[PDB]
Protein backbone atom coordinates (compact mmCIF):
# COMPACT_ATOMS: atom_id res chain seq x y z
CA UNK A 1 0.00 0.00 0.00
CA UNK A 2 3.12 2.17 0.29
CA UNK A 3 5.61 2.32 -2.56
CA UNK A 4 7.17 5.74 -2.24
CA UNK A 5 10.57 6.60 -3.63
CA UNK A 6 12.38 6.00 -0.34
CA UNK A 7 10.15 3.28 1.11
CA UNK A 8 12.07 0.58 2.93
CA UNK A 9 15.32 2.56 3.07
CA UNK A 10 15.39 3.10 6.84
CA UNK A 11 18.82 1.50 7.20
CA UNK A 12 20.20 1.50 3.66
CA UNK A 13 20.04 5.29 3.36
CA UNK A 14 21.25 5.98 6.90
CA UNK A 15 24.77 7.17 7.61
CA UNK A 16 27.19 4.89 9.42
CA UNK A 17 27.95 5.28 13.11
CA UNK A 18 30.19 8.31 13.68
CA UNK A 19 30.40 8.76 9.90
CA UNK A 20 27.72 11.41 9.52
CA UNK A 21 28.18 14.74 7.80
CA UNK A 22 28.54 15.92 4.23
CA UNK A 23 30.87 14.32 1.71
CA UNK A 24 34.57 15.07 1.99
CA UNK A 25 35.95 17.87 -0.14
CA UNK A 26 38.39 15.51 -1.85
CA UNK A 27 35.55 13.47 -3.34
CA UNK A 28 34.71 16.34 -5.69
CA UNK A 29 38.20 15.95 -7.18
CA UNK A 30 37.45 12.42 -8.38
CA UNK A 31 38.21 11.92 -12.07
CA UNK A 32 35.52 10.32 -14.22
CA UNK A 33 35.63 9.40 -17.90
CA UNK A 34 33.17 7.98 -20.39
CA UNK A 35 32.73 4.23 -20.41
CA UNK A 36 34.52 3.44 -17.16
CA UNK A 37 32.85 1.46 -14.41
CA UNK A 38 31.36 3.26 -11.43
CA UNK A 39 29.62 2.20 -8.22
CA UNK A 40 26.31 3.69 -7.14
CA UNK A 41 26.29 4.23 -3.38
CA UNK A 42 23.69 6.69 -2.14
CA UNK A 43 24.92 9.49 0.10
CA UNK A 44 21.98 10.52 2.26
CA UNK A 45 23.55 13.88 3.10
CA UNK A 46 23.02 14.97 -0.51
CA UNK A 47 19.35 14.73 -1.40
CA UNK A 48 19.23 15.96 -4.98
CA UNK A 49 20.53 13.49 -7.52
CA UNK A 50 19.86 10.59 -5.20
CA UNK A 51 19.67 7.18 -6.90
CA UNK A 52 16.67 4.97 -6.46
CA UNK A 53 16.59 2.38 -3.68
CA UNK A 54 17.34 -0.53 -6.01
CA UNK A 55 20.56 0.82 -7.51
CA UNK A 56 22.32 1.39 -4.20
CA UNK A 57 25.42 -0.77 -4.35
CA UNK A 58 25.09 -1.59 -8.03
CA UNK A 59 27.78 -1.06 -10.66
CA UNK A 60 27.59 0.25 -14.19
CA UNK A 61 29.57 2.02 -16.86
CA UNK A 62 29.24 5.75 -17.41
CA UNK A 63 27.34 6.71 -20.54
CA UNK A 64 26.88 10.42 -19.82
CA UNK A 65 28.70 13.13 -17.88
CA UNK A 66 27.22 16.54 -17.05
CA UNK A 67 28.44 19.47 -14.99
CA UNK A 68 27.58 17.86 -11.64
CA UNK A 69 25.94 14.58 -12.63
CA UNK A 70 26.63 11.19 -14.16
CA UNK A 71 24.32 9.02 -16.21
CA UNK A 72 25.35 5.41 -15.64
CA UNK A 73 23.96 2.36 -17.44
CA UNK A 74 22.93 -0.39 -15.01
CA UNK A 75 21.55 -3.87 -15.58
CA UNK A 76 18.24 -4.54 -13.84
CA UNK A 77 16.57 -7.94 -13.65
CA UNK A 78 12.88 -7.74 -14.60
CA UNK A 79 11.13 -11.12 -14.40
CA UNK A 80 12.35 -13.01 -17.45
CA UNK A 81 15.07 -10.69 -18.73
CA UNK A 82 17.79 -8.26 -17.81
CA UNK A 83 17.44 -4.79 -19.24
CA UNK A 84 19.64 -1.73 -19.44
CA UNK A 85 18.61 1.25 -17.32
CA UNK A 86 20.01 4.76 -17.56
CA UNK A 87 20.15 6.17 -14.03
CA UNK A 88 21.13 9.81 -13.57
CA UNK A 89 22.74 10.73 -10.25
CA UNK A 90 24.91 13.46 -8.80
CA UNK A 91 28.64 13.21 -8.13
CA UNK A 92 28.33 12.48 -4.41
CA UNK A 93 26.32 9.31 -5.09
CA UNK A 94 28.89 7.78 -7.44
CA UNK A 95 32.39 6.45 -6.85
CA UNK A 96 35.11 4.93 -9.00
CA UNK A 97 34.62 1.17 -9.17
CA UNK A 98 37.44 -1.19 -8.24
CA UNK A 99 35.69 -4.01 -10.11
CA UNK A 100 38.31 -3.60 -12.85
CA UNK A 101 41.49 -2.86 -10.92
CA UNK A 102 42.78 -6.43 -10.80
CA UNK A 103 42.21 -6.68 -14.55
CA UNK A 104 44.05 -3.41 -15.21
CA UNK A 105 47.03 -4.38 -13.06
CA UNK A 106 47.07 -7.79 -14.72
CA UNK A 107 47.11 -6.14 -18.13
CA UNK A 108 50.06 -3.89 -17.27
CA UNK A 109 52.09 -6.58 -15.51
CA UNK A 110 51.39 -9.20 -18.17
CA UNK A 111 52.39 -6.76 -20.91
CA UNK A 112 55.71 -6.00 -19.26
CA UNK A 113 56.23 -9.74 -18.74
CA UNK A 114 55.33 -10.68 -22.32
CA UNK A 115 57.73 -8.06 -23.65
CA UNK A 116 60.71 -9.55 -21.81
CA UNK A 117 59.60 -13.12 -22.55
CA UNK A 118 59.43 -12.42 -26.28
CA UNK A 119 62.76 -10.61 -26.00
CA UNK A 120 64.40 -13.70 -24.51
CA UNK A 121 62.37 -15.99 -26.82
CA UNK A 122 60.60 -17.91 -24.05
CA UNK A 123 57.17 -19.49 -23.89
CA UNK A 124 55.17 -18.44 -20.82
CA UNK A 125 51.68 -19.05 -19.50
CA UNK A 126 49.95 -15.70 -19.12
CA UNK A 127 46.58 -17.03 -17.94
CA UNK A 128 45.70 -17.05 -14.26
CA UNK A 129 46.65 -20.18 -12.41
CA UNK A 130 43.48 -21.22 -10.47
CA UNK A 131 45.80 -22.96 -8.05
CA UNK A 132 44.70 -26.41 -6.96
CA UNK A 133 46.48 -29.40 -5.48
CA UNK A 134 49.78 -28.85 -3.72
CA UNK A 135 52.82 -31.04 -4.41
CA UNK A 136 54.32 -33.61 -2.10
CA UNK A 137 56.37 -32.13 0.73
CA UNK A 138 59.14 -33.61 2.87
CA UNK A 139 58.67 -31.80 6.16
CA UNK A 140 60.64 -31.92 9.41
CA UNK A 141 59.34 -31.23 12.91
CA UNK A 142 60.93 -31.55 16.37
CA UNK A 143 59.61 -34.47 18.44
CA UNK A 144 58.86 -32.01 21.25
CA UNK A 145 56.46 -30.28 18.86
CA UNK A 146 54.10 -33.18 18.11
CA UNK A 147 51.28 -33.08 20.64
CA UNK A 148 48.76 -35.86 21.19
CA UNK A 149 45.09 -34.88 20.88
CA UNK A 150 42.21 -36.90 22.24
CA UNK A 151 38.56 -35.88 22.67
CA UNK A 152 37.77 -34.13 25.92
CA UNK A 153 35.39 -35.45 28.57
CA UNK A 154 32.12 -33.70 29.41
CA UNK A 155 31.76 -31.23 32.26
Amino acid sequence: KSRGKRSGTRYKFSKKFRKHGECTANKYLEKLNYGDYVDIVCDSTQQKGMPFNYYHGKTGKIFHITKRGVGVLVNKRVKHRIEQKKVCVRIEHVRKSRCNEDFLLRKIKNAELIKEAKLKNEHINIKRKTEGPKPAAMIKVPPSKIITIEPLPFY
Binding site: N75, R77, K79, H80, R81, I82, E83, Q84
Partner: peptide, 14 residues
Protein backbone atom coordinates in the same frame (compact mmCIF):
# COMPACT_ATOMS: atom_id res chain seq x y z
CA UNK B 1 6.42 -20.65 -10.54
CA UNK B 2 7.45 -17.18 -11.73
CA UNK B 3 11.15 -18.02 -11.49
CA UNK B 4 10.56 -21.22 -13.45
CA UNK B 5 8.70 -19.27 -16.11
CA UNK B 6 11.50 -16.72 -16.25
CA UNK B 7 14.22 -19.33 -16.64
CA UNK B 8 12.28 -21.42 -19.15
CA UNK B 9 13.37 -19.02 -21.90
CA UNK B 10 16.46 -18.05 -19.90
CA UNK B 11 17.19 -14.66 -18.36
CA UNK B 12 17.73 -12.69 -21.56
CA UNK B 13 20.59 -10.28 -21.59
CA UNK B 14 20.59 -6.90 -23.34
Amino acid sequence: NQNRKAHKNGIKKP
